[PDB]
């Protein structure tokens, strides 16, 4: 009202209030008579992005709503971060990045590795070298 058309990576087209879909600084710039295409964002992920943006269109410590909305699996979080990054939507980049950062809080190295299924790259002498460099910072 007026509305622009957005094509996801897997065919599906979407239309959106032009001023809601300008929380993205990427598309904002592109507007300056087709459908704009988005290689890196698929349907599942694009739908949540316009959603997050419509809820946040009227707007001037992670709001309750943002927390429930983001109660998804690691993998779709990751893709959320990426779209946010590619579309350049600061607000969304920030809560997603925080939400992932909150899963790193309070945990040991082994506990972090396990949450994200990361393999210990390290030799035991490389580990010991890292604790040494962290001397200034321990109690």
């Amino acid at each position: 009202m007026p509305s622009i058309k957005l094509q996801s990576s897997d065919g599906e087209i979407f239309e959106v209030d032009v001023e809601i879909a300008k929380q993205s600084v990427t598309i904002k710039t592109m507007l300056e008579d087709d459908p704009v295409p988005l290689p890196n964002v698929n349907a599942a992920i694009l739908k949540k992005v316009i959603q997050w943006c419509t809820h946040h269109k009227d707007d001037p410590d992670i709001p309750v709503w943002d927390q429930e909305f983001l109660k998804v699996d690691q993998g779709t979080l990751f893709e959320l971060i990426l779209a946010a990054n590619y579309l350049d939507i600061k607000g969304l980049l920030d809560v997603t990045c925080k939400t992932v950062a909150n899963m790193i809080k309070g945990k040991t190295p082994e506990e972090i590795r396990k949450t994200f299924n990361i393999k210990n790259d390290f030799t035991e002498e490389e580990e010991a070298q890292v604790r040494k460099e962290n001397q200034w910072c321990e109690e």
Binding site: F78, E79, L82, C97, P109, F116, I118, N120
Partner: protein
């Protein structure tokens, strides 16, 4: 699909680390794997935590030996002296000597408020006609400066204080600041030369200032004491006035 946090772009991983409290990044996250260790040891992560929190801007143009250190110290930076202007009476201060008609608290003139390059000094402490001294001890650990930070980095310790005394004043302004060990044993003392104190005793607000550098390992407390010591010639009902005292720890 991204099937693992480490398939994210480096730039995003940096962005994530940004939101992890720094202490935890260093102790826990440098250990998770070698990618994380390499990423966390880049200047750019810290450089831009600093930016997200106001400690610096785009026009930052000074060499910084270690950005992790720089970051923590700026993050902890604030006056470590409680109730330095007299917004809450004598709370937090020991009236070590409280002679005469005693220490008072009183309001600054709107004219005298300008003499501070802060708008936010609205009161002072003033001494009586006999000697009056007060004190406060800073507990470094308890203010966020853990031990190995003090010992390893030896960050600069900056002390300031403002007073006003007439040249003719019946009691002379005095200031002593000592660094102290875990035993409360002195590890460096500062008193300003009395000559340059008398020089500052026109009737206006003057700063006095000092920075301790290269102090030894072991510093756990700082003792700060000030007031007026009686000259023994009467010259009025009050002596030095003092306010806006401060102690901070700055990136060295």
């Amino acid at each position: 699909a991204v099937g693992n946090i480490n398939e994210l772009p480096e730039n995003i991983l940096l962005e994530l680390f940004t939101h992890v409290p720094a202490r935890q990044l260093l102790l826990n996250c440098r250990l998770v794997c070698s990618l994380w260790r390499d990423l966390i040891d880049l200047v750019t992560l810290w450089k831009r935590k600093c930016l997200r929190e106001g400690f610096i801007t785009e026009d930052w143009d000074q060499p910084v030996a270690d950005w992790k250190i720089f970051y923590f110290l700026r993050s902890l930076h604030r006056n470590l002296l409680h109730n330095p202007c007299a917004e809450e009476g004598f709370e937090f201060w020991s009236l070590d000597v409280n002679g005469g008609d005693e220490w008072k608290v009183e309001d600054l003139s709107r004219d005298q408020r300008k003499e501070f390059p802060n708008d936010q000094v609205k009161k002072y402490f003033v001494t009586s006609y006999y000697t009056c001294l007060k004190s406060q001890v800073v507990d470094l650990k308890a203010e966020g400066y853990w031990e190995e930070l003090m010992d390893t980095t030896r960050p600069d310790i900056e002390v300031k204080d403002w007073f006003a005394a007439r040249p003719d004043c019946g009691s002379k302004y005095q200031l002593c600041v000592q660094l102290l060990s875990s035993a409360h044993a002195p590890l460096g003392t500062f008193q300003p030369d009395p000559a340059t104190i008398q020089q500052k005793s026109d009737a206006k607000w003057r700063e006095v200032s000092h920075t301790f550098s290269n102090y030894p390992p072991g510093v756990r407390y700082i003792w700060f004491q000030h007031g007026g010591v009686d000259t023994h010639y009467w010259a009025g009902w009050y002596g030095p006035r003092v306010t806006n005292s401060s102690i901070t720890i700055r990136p060295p």
